[PDB]
Amino acid sequence: SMQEEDTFRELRIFLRNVTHRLAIDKRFRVFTKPVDPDEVPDYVTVIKQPMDLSSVISKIDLHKYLTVKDYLRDIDLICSNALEYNPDRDPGDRLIRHRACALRDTAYAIIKEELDEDFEQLCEEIQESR
């Protein structure tokens, strides 16, 4: 219905705002764009489904997220990919891992504090009906 499309539009507005706040954080710059094959060549040997904040923005605008849970799966994918590609004790690895976990934690905390539980429940019920 029209009212359901208004609900998903509010979700998209909320998700763009959260994603923008993550994307301007200096700590998360490494997660703002896809990994350049020129820069690191072996990234696709390890990471089968790349995800980044620019791709998250594109998916919001393609109406790919109908619930915050769909969105958080892609945030979680950014994080789990980073931990997978940076498993070593080396400080470069440990820095990216720390930032990846901070990105995930920050996103979850913003959503816990700012997304109304009943709003998310509505999104899920509209989704479960299609």
Q: How far is residue 121 from each of residues 52, 58, 66, 102, 129, measured CA to CA in Å?
A: 26, 24, 11, 26, 12
Question: Rounded CA gap, 21 and 127, in Å?
Answer: 26
Give the 3-state DSSP-derived string for the chain, with helices as H, strands as E and coil as C. CHHHHHHHHHHHHHHHHHHHHHHCCHHHHHHCCCCCCCCCCCHHHHCCCCCCHHHHHHHHHCCCCCCHHHHHHHHHHHHHHHHHHCCCCCHHHHHHHHHHHHHHHHHHHHHHHHCCHHHHHHHHHHHHCC
Resolution, expressed in angstroms to one decimal: 1.9
67-98 burial: b if 16+ Cβ within 10 Å, else e: bbebbeebbebbbebbeebbeeeeeeeeebbe
User: Which pair of tokens denotes residue 2?
Assistant: 């029209």
User: Which pair of tokens denotes residue 103?
Assistant: 């990105």
Question: Rounded CA gap, 51 and 36, in Å?
Answer: 13
What the chain holds in terms of domains, given with CATH numbers, is: 1-130 (1.20.920.10)
